[PDB]
Design a protein around this ligand. Sequence first.
Ligand SMILES: *[C@@H]1O[C@H](CO)[C@@H](O)[C@H](O)[C@H]1NC(C)=O
Ligand SMILES: *[C@@H]1O[C@H](CO)[C@@H](O)[C@H](O)[C@H]1NC(C)=O
Ligand SMILES: *[C@@H]1O[C@H](CO)[C@@H](O)[C@H](O)[C@H]1NC(C)=O
Ligand SMILES: *[C@@H]1O[C@H](CO)[C@@H](O)[C@H](O)[C@H]1NC(C)=O
Ligand SMILES: [Fe+3]
Lengths: 182, 11, 642, 362
Amino acid sequence: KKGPKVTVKVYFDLRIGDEDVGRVIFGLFGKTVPKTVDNFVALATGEKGFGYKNSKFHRVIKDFMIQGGDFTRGDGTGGKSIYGERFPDENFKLKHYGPGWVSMANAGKDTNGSQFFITTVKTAWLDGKHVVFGKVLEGMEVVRKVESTKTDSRDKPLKDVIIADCGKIEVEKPFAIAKEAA
Amino acid sequence: XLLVTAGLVLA
Amino acid sequence: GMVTPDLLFAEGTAAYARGDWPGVVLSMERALRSRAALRALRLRCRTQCAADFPWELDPDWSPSPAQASGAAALRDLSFFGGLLRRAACLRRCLGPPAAHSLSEEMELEFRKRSPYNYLQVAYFKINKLEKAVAAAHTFFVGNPEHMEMQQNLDYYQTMSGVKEADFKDLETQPHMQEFRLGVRLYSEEQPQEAVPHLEAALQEYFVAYEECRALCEGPYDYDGYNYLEYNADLFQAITDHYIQVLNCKQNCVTELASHPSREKPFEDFLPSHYNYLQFAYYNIGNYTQAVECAKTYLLFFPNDEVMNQNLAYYAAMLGEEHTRSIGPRESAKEYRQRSLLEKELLFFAYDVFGIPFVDPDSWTPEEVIPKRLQEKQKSERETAVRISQEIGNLMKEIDVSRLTREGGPLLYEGISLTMNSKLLNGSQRVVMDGVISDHECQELQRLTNVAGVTVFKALKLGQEGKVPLQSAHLYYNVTEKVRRIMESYFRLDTPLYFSYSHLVCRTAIEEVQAERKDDSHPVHVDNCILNAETLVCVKEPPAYTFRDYSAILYLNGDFDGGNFYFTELDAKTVTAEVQPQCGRAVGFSSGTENPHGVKAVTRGQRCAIALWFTLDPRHSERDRVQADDLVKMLFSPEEMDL
Amino acid sequence: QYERYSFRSFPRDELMPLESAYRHALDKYSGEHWAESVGYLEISLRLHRLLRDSEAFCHRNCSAAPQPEPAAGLASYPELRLFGGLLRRAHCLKRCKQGLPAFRQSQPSREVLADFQRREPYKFLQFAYFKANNLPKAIAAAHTFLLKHPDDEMMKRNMAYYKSLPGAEDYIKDLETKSYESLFIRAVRAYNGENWRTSITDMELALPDFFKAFYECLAACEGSREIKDFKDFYLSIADHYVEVLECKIQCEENLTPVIGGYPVEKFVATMYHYLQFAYYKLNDLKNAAPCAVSYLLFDQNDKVMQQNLVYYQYHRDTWGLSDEHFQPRPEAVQFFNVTTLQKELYDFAKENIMDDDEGEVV
Ligand SMILES: *[C@@H]1O[C@H](CO)[C@@H](O)[C@H](O)[C@H]1NC(C)=O
Ligand SMILES: *[C@@H]1O[C@H](CO)[C@@H](O)[C@H](O)[C@H]1NC(C)=O
Ligand SMILES: *[C@@H]1O[C@H](CO)[C@@H](O)[C@H](O)[C@H]1NC(C)=O
Ligand SMILES: *[C@@H]1O[C@H](CO)[C@@H](O)[C@H](O)[C@H]1NC(C)=O
Ligand SMILES: [Fe+3]
């Protein structure tokens, strides 16, 4: 079988409430969607200053997504990319294949921003309306633990999901990944 | 329903 | 190429918010350089290796019966192989396509020259007055309605700096710059200094047209989220893309003839050049050039009496042999030939596929218009003067504006005029009663309850069999009837086109109504965006600026609340309200003088139809053609022998 | 299921969308109802065949058009001429499609057509036939499915079980057959029975049908696609052809008749070899030479009939053959052109046009 390549890695570190769980080593395609992958990478390094450092996971729905990210506000329509406020969707080349894929949460057509969502099951309801730009490659148990916290009526976790660290990990030779899950 | 939007959250 | 300009623009905006003047000036200069570099690279390689590989087209066979479709297969193969070679060259040139893509508001601010405003502010803060005044003059030329820039220009003129003849423009295309100065010089009766300027303007206009024709080719345009339901074949998609490309190419003629200082594109741009040029040549005395220019203009217009007399006079002063000796210029001939060919192709496409097109030239002969299209233009011209007579009868029998532009014939029998504009305390407003019946009403309710829905989607669902077909047909019929009566009532001469239409129903959930003091829908206007305390209205791409008339048709009244009310520009003082019923229709212009708001429904169902019309044929709702094709093919079709 | 089929005179009672009929058939099969499922599946197959025939008829004309009266000034701008011809062809196709009754319903999605091209409903159809005392029909459907897919295990087990049943050993018939394949089978039977005139008659009947079927099946490959990117004009429309050419390249191999469980390689080559041998047996050199030339064109690597051609050239001044009789038949030249050009274009396209972002999963 066939699959896309990878170019860069990020080592997102979550902390549930007052506890630390692990290290979700990500994986980002850098030759199929060149732009959004630059958005995420440059934004996750604290380059300009609008970093993901000390962000909030607002929506945690039990079995569809774990989406959350905003440094301006804490849960609202807060968002600020580097290309302005709205960078056009570029190519819907891949489709969500089961657990553990990363795609951009838009608000319509040509209204992207900085709000990433990790999928937990196959989610074909949305397909071709959202651009996917990365696959996780480690630490599913961390997502499993962060997905099982007591939620509220408005999907906000009762406790807080603080992202306490990030950065860059480089790979010097693009390898390949499969196309089913994990 | 099950959408992932930023601003007008729908059903 | 450099990095994408939008990133530099964002960094400069952030620095300006912080207040780092060297940072902002550096960022704006880099972005301005990068834009031009990217555009030049694209144009250069596109034209160079579009000219590298010609289209040959050697039709050296006659397909005979005993070869079958093999000849057609080979014909397709050779052409598409050439296409593949050209695509290979384009891909090996352009590199990463992503660097050439940017959102619409970025081009909006680039057109508005905001970076020049930031640059002039920074330069004033850094004491580089020359660049500051240059950028300020450029911005003022771009936007002549900004009094603050005028004040800054006056201040800079008063104290140290430069004179009135060094205010460079760094944005306007070269070809237009000499044209205006040439016209001004001709105005002060200085023909000696005129002719070189017009000649340079001609050459630069030809070069600019050549550049514009080779920069248009770009991505196809879809309508919103229509990617998923696109089911065209290869030969259909190619033709659609080429038709859109040709329309965009032809738009280069009306684009180059526009300046921000004016609010109307210059009429007959090319012919006026030759008219002024021949007048100047007659003034100086160069007779041969004068008669040549007169012949070149008469090529465009073969029946202009004035310069016909002028040419007869010039021949009278000159000799006959020289008169037939000199002919027109070849560049105009080539331009005319190519333009006529493109116009013929566009008109054939409009006749066949029903894709709207408007002629940007007034010199097109009628021989290229297909016969079917000519009859339609004859019909609209007849009714254009018919309505003009009816209005003229009114004031001769006689606040005017509320009398001469409403009170239509109300063609369809049965309709009443229960509710009129004066009673509402407002203008361009009317509420109709009885455009539909009661027995027809519940069909629409069934249609919307079974499955906002568009007419085309309802037709498709009826074709599949999910919903009854009769209700779908009635939807189209009532839409057409309401469109025609809305056009007729307001005494409109220009034919009225379709913008958007969808049938929607609102459900009041009784679990979120607690402490729901907030209004369901804020008071707003359709064409522009409304500011509450600022009391301003701006026609910007965030809103649709082509909408002119809006009409709402009601279907049920078994609910509490949801009354339709009109409010002033303050969005606080309610002017008038209407009561929902069955068969009532509200008609009002979508202008800034009709702010509307919808209250919240207590309990029940509210289902109604939303309609918008535009007076610009360019912004016509494109999905109506497929609806017409489906309607003519499903209910009253035709068949072949086998 | 194909006996009461007529492309021209089609019963209007069963004119329903394909997807609805397929869904009803699947629901009835899940409901343990057999006769209704059999009828619905037969209706679905008939609708699919009707759609294919309608496409073939619509592409019979329109594509095969001459010159729509060009002008004397249009010849200076090749692009305008080419795109005007394309526009005329597209308009003619659009006007032709609406006429046929089969296009007056809801078109099926791409995945339904892909499934039908894989002969998948035959599994349920044969299961229903077996559940309805139709052993010959069931075994015929199983053989038909195994012909296209000879690598199944469950279907192989069912075929083995059906063969074990006595009586059902002669009803091995392909439910999706073609006229040229049957004519070829009879012709090879006659040639093995040392019959010549009947053999050559069958060859000259069968060859044009095979060429026609190949050309129509090629003309039926320019379908739609799923849009997933937005590029410039040339780049955007140079990928739709990449996809349709990928579909086209298998056209020749998908129509190859299969006997004994093995596809017969070089169908046209063996065709011309048999024709040449038959003509030689009747001493009809006038017609024998072009077949040998065509075979040499299809495959230069030979020793026997190359020597035969040498012998014919040596005795060219004996039976009275001009130099014009030593050229291949035009149809063979057309086939060679249309195959070699397609392969060369595919090889060229898969070096610069196709994007390089995929890799091998280790
Ligand atoms: C008219 O102008 C042309 C070039 O502009 C020049 O060659 C010619 O001499 C001029 N005519 C006269 C009478 O000078
Ligand atoms: C719609 O109007 C057409 C007029 O051409 C008429 O023939 C048809 O019966 C009407 N159908 C309905 C449902 O009103
Ligand atoms: C193709 O359509 C045209 C329409 O005028 C018709 O005359 C022609 O006979 C059709 N082709 C065939 C093979 O019937
Ligand atoms: C078809 O035959 C060969 C292909 O190998 C070549 O000469 C050309 O493509 C075609 N011949 C003619 C005479 O067009
Ligand atoms: Fe509104």
